[PDB]
Amino acid sequence: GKKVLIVYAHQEPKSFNGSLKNVAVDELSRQGCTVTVSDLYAMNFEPRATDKDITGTLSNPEVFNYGVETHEAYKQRSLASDITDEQKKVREADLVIFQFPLYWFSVPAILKGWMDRVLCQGFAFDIPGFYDSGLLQGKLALLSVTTGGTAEMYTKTGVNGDSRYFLWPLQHGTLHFCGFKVLAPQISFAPEIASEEERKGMVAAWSQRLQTIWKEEPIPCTAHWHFG
Template sequence: MKFKATATAEDITGDVKNGEHFCYAEETKLAWEEGKLCADITEEQRKLTQADLIIFQFPMYWFTVPAIMKGWIDRVLSLGYAYSQDKRYSQGIFKDKKAMLSFTTGSHETMFSANGINGDMNVTLWPLQNGILHYCGFQVLAPQIFWAPSYIPSEARITMLEGWRMRLQGLMGEKVLSFTPLDCFDGEKGYKLKPELHEKQATKEFGLTVGVHLGMVIPPNSQMKAGV
């Protein structure tokens, strides 16, 4: 499938509301409400609406998704359709759907460890899994990571694929990753963690999540394994 890597005003058919001070999110929200988004976007949104599970398959590129996939995210997960001020995170629009990342890396697993040169993979995944998938309400399954397939023997790559095939058979029954629910944050005070929850967490060994760590130790593997 060909898909633009950049979101532009061309994603809207017809005139925009405010061309002088163009705001992509607001303009696409209006276009979505009025049925004026481009056909390629509406087709992807149709498929997403019908899906129970979305698997993002990609080669990790500069520690994130390739530009063409980022373009898909920017254009398809539009304001109004995929999220709103009131419908996001644990109360998000896609809270009845599951999503996951499945990707290859150019570096070995040791390089993405907590003491590896690339840094902790849990930290790398936080913007993608929390800031995009969970933000839209998806229940996020643990990622499927194929570590440095270009640098291992063919037999090892075959083993990787067999493990993925086996996992796919029971994927929908897996537990999902844990994120702090939206109602744990005080919307009237800038969506900061409620004081009583902050106080309760202070007695524990780890912070809540990779992002909401409260200045404490980041919980190990919380972005890579369910139930952590």
């Protein structure tokens, strides 16, 4: 009985991202999984890390330090409820899928804000308690990314460099840091210029992969895997 959270970052339900999110919901639901989706734009999710994220007395009201104050607020249970709502979803999930279009070799800012605000010290990691010792150990994560650039542009000898290069801050710096094991990324290249049949093939490839997702092992989330 597996639980899945999909954190979804696209403005348009009819988009290629919307279709990938929906096929994931359909297929995981068909399998009998418990499925939850955080539709960040529809939630008008707050991306900014501010003192509003702490709802009670600050430990140093003279000089605001976001990391210190959110860590303390997590322990005291005085974080803003939008954050703790997301933490509950993550805590319960066996697998977290992130579905998003690549923006500037990274995640859209609304999703960056989810990472910044939800993955606070005490919840996602501690010092010590990170990388293999991260607090979300035992959980799986998977990035399902769409791009403007073609697969060929995203090779070692391409203009954009290899696709694994841009995965490093997300897979290693964020997910592995918090203790997740990382499943191989799903990258759907350049749907805007793909043919209708090619688009349909990309969506079907994702649905098909999800059929056996619970049999997969994570990647070795290392510099070598990313950079060779």
